[PDB]
Symmetry: C4
Subunit: 387 residues, 4 copies
């Protein structure tokens, strides 16, 4: 039966660790895919990890030059959550250097973008069958979430971007049914910039927290209903959510220009005027990670907060992060549970290796007792392939 998506987010006081795959550590010997931009999504029966391979294994020569973002060798694959991404335990989804996926309760929808930078095509699959395609409309690296799409009442929603990553671009919202695009709309967002949206369902509507790679060290957001009637803005909190960023101070309801160039995929959960902010501990690089509750951070520019939970140490590598949800249909609860994953990036450019890859950790929001700590990657680089 199709996910209803009409309940609100569950109240959350803390985050319980959900999984950790130790990919890099194990790939030191085992047969583990070189990967990046992993993410988690759940069917009514299980939770899977999606990832973009580089068509190579760790500690092999073909892992060389994997700093590179796009190529014909990259593919979208998935394995069970907490398991290592291996050729022996991973299912093939699509050929892609950018992707999204989500389960509407009936079947898996996957979105895989491949092809040249000036004419990339997104292939939509429903239950493993090609159901639709969309070609670049600006001919400049058509790209998408790199996390799960959001499903409500039999429809799945995603956001896509085409154009410059350092200037005004084009952003479109899609409504998809049975892997078929049934409605789309371009966002009227002059001076905004959207990348790698983390979108989730909440009371029959979708909320996306994204990445301003242009000129915003705070995060941009889009919320829309099933008819794609949307609203835009930036998270107001003085607790800046992007990386790099400036030290915490007074925030803005518009793009915070200071340290606003570049960025990293992230997320956040809106509760009334309050916000759950996941972010790196460092303001300059992709190190550490922490969850921060600002009861007034969604609409207020104050730099205060009530709660702060450690996820990854300040001196440890982190990277991308994104949201995923567990619907009532899966949990048996009467509300949509917020979860999140973190990508722990190892290798280039920060380390002396020929390769770049990441492992993952994940947490779920609970109202019972929790605790901070540091669950880092834990691999020792360089590897033998790098010597």
């Amino acid at each position: 039966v199709k996910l209803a998506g009409n309940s609100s987010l569950c109240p959350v006081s803390g985050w319980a660790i959900y999984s950790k795959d130790n990919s890099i550590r194990i790939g030191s010997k085992g047969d583990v895919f070189v990967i990046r931009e992993p993410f988690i999504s759940c069917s009514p029966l299980e939770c899977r990890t999606f990832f973009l391979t580089q068509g190579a294994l760790l500690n092999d020569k073909h892992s060389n030059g994997t700093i590179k973002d796009r190529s014909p060798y990259r593919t979208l694959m998935s394995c069970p959550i907490g398991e290592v991404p291996s050729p022996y335990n991973s299912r093939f989804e699509s050929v892609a250097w950018s992707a999204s996926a989500c389960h509407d309760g009936i079947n898996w929808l996957t979105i895989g973008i491949s092809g040249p930078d000036n004419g990339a095509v997104a292939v939509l699959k429903y239950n493993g069958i090609i159901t639709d395609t969309i070609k670049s409309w600006r001919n400049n690296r058509l790209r998408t979430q790199e996390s799960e799409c959001a499903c409500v009442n039999g429809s799945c929603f995603t956001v896509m971007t085409d154009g410059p990553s350092d200037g005004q671009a084009s952003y479109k919202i899609f409504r998809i049914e049975k892997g078929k695009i049934v409605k789309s709309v371009e966002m009227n967002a002059p001076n905004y910039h959207y990348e790698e949206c983390s979108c989730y369902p909440d009371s029959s509507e979708i909320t996306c927290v994204c990445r301003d790679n242009w000129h915003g060290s705070n995060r941009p957001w889009v919320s829309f209903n099933q008819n794609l009637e949307y609203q835009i803005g930036y998270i107001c909190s003085g607790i800046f959510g992007d990386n790099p960023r400036p030290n915490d101070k007074t925030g803005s309801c518009g793009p915070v220009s200071s340290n606003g160039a570049n960025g990293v995929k992230g997320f956040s959960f809106k509760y009334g005027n309050g916000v759950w902010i996941g972010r790196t501990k460092s303001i300059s690089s992709r190190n550490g990670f922490e969850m921060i509750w600002d009861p007034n951070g969604w609409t207020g520019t104050d730099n205060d907060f009530s709660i702060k939970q450690d996820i990854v140490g300040i001196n440890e590598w982190s990277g991308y992060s994104g949201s995923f949800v567990q619907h009532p249909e899966l949990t048996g609860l009467d509300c949509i549970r917020p979860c999140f994953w973190v990508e722990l990036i190892r290798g280039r450019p920060k380390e002396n290796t020929i390769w770049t890859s990441g492992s993952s950790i994940s947490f779920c929001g609970v109202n019972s007792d929790t605790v901070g700590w540091s669950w880092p990657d834990g691999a020792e680089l360089p590897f033998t392939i790098d010597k």
Copy 2:
């Protein structure tokens, strides 16, 4: 329920990438079978990759001398599409140095030919159980499609060849039910030559596009109904489909003798007088690949064409190619969707290695937007086993 096979091919304007396994790249470290002549076929529930192993893994000593076509060690195995062919994820089908397979909607039929060059026997299995055999009738390398057989209304059809590969030979059409041969007929084709047929269902009849290894740089074809009442001919288009071949010029409805010796397994899709032609970019070797639409190419000798889509670069290795279909029972469409796979051959004879193997890519025909590009093998030879 059994596939009806009575709808016509879906109209197709372009080809969307469906899968890529990156076998050679991964086999550089992982435990991946040395293989060749792979192909794809679909049950009403999934799509699998079939392949002939050499009973050896890449980057191992036993991969040595794998240039050789036939031997007792070769076996027919299958794994899920897009996955690497590994001993840890592959299912054993049959002992074979030549094979075909297809699902009639109820169960898998596999055809595996093994034994000596002068008395090979084809073993038919239905749902993994031996249901029939056929021995060589000309005692000269009994061989078959190396791609999926075609199923219609509970019957599966294949084509087999016995005799010289550089002169007139013998070609038979078979009708098979529950893995049991219920009717066969010899093709009356003096001056024709058939090898490695790519056959597909279309409106209750079967169409096969094959390989004239004798004296034809254009492709031969056979079409028959369920009672094995057939027609033969050659694709007329001046867009020659085999390799090697001459530069494009005026074609023929008979075998184009020029550069007609040798060849490579290929395919094509007939739409009225028009044809979808898949072929290498090079006219001399197995490099590149492209899809070309000639609205008059099936029955006309003109060397014109409306559409051309790049699949593999001119300077990249290709190889065999073949068709497969997804029936309405699988897709939910009201027509039979045309798909195709390409074998990317690496190693001998063109490269300095002790071994020969291939990886695969696949596409499906869509009417939505698509794009050309190059999705090559991407491995760096020689391997460590070759040093």
Copy 3:
């Protein structure tokens, strides 16, 4: 349907070997997790091996320093009984450096403790979904069974410990339903010490045999009904069950202070006044293993016994051991069958390696003929990674 748990233990005259995975031997080449504290538990359909990984594979550099008990890299995983614990065949359960698991007949309950030594949190999962958490209440290494929890009539029971491991600590009994804690009680046990309880169901009540790490070379026990109304004591037999211990002599119904410091996880089965005692053959180190029937050993201090069966040779490595049961729902018997597993520890601290790991053997209680022998680990250390 939920396990009834109301039948009594089956009479048992001997122990039949049930499984052996040969993990270390195979991990010498294969991709096998470095593990410790493994244990077995059964659903109404199968029996699985649970284990705590160190996030590393044998014969790899990351296996280094695995003597260490707790860290963020450790995870709870499971595979089918008798199979090697591998990334390619193991299912991920939870992030944990201490754990318990058990099936109530409907779904799997897993308990994974992670976090810092001064604030560890136990995460309860039911069917893979987080259902509850418990934080350390003494802020000193919250820890649990390291073996299966006990289920009766739809409720699962475990025992947890927080505080010193060399002095008085705090011990709590939990009642859990659908992975949700519905009742708990602190044990009033001054001068007792409980660690790593081996608990089993018997006639609608739970019996736990544990490890006094403080001052008892005989084993402590807890028995309670569904309402958590409990009794405590120590096994009286002069056949001391812990390691290290003194030579057999007159026992005590209280902690035997002599050689009472430290210990090792163990178990025992109560039959009236009699006891089935599993223990190391050595009184000083973790070598050998034997099953001993003392018809008066539960309540009597005599050092006599009727039956003695060899499991592991005196000069062979052993380690932890624990009980598991097979309910009538699984076996078809009208009684709860007692089984047990043994952890064969290799590496540090007793051997010259950088790593520490264990393999496992298991037996089931039968009333038919059996025999003693020695089923040791059988690996040759050091490994190549240690050179």
Copy 4:
């Protein structure tokens, strides 16, 4: 539903190759168990390969000394037919240095013998649960078929041997239901010798062809009904079936003393007075293999034969062989199909290696066309571990 076992063997004119796993070749790099005495057995849904591991992988140090027959490390495992026996694809059955297995249509029965030479115990499992045990009654290497047991009308039958392997011993027939021994009888066979019986069902009765290791270069046989009312004898044919043996001449209905010491596990199929004989091509060592039809060979001493089919070349390694059947319930036929497997032994004692292991091939009896050939192991010894 339970196998009826009441139809007769299907008429067979030849043997079609069914599978080949290429284990040794692949284990040169892959993670493949060192094994010996493999065998095949079928459930109503699939056919599996059973084998005794040595608790080690090929090309690893622990494979050393695997010439040895019995040890605590050996285990009974199974994987799908034609697949390599790997820790990543094999299911654990039982701890054993001798075994049998068979499916009664409802569940798998496995028999695993382990323990010391002077008190071995056979553990019977039904659907993975221990259901019974039998201890050595002569205290001299209790051993069994090393091939599938035979099932008829809900009962499974096996033969076991205890005592000298070079003199008179003790042989018992067992009737087993739900893994529980319900009847047994000792064979009154003075001057006979039985080892490693290949037993099959035929018209509600069981026929076993075995190995006289004492003083018979022709094969001994036992046939019994469900009540264990039996008959004994030796295959009369002058086509001697054991190895070693003398050149073919006039046979005997008693043990052929000439070259009668030692032997090798084999099989044969009785059709009236005629016999299908599988045997090595060499009379002195375990090389080659061939199927021979002697229409009068069961009861006649003539050294004539009608049909001879090559399976393995004279100069290629062979080894054990055994029968297995596919019941009507599996095939849909109205008769029990005879199949057979061959073990291709590599390594010690005949080759310069530290290890010993085997791969397998299998065939099924058909009435359609077949052909002889040689499907050998195909590995190049020694391996790197042997250097």
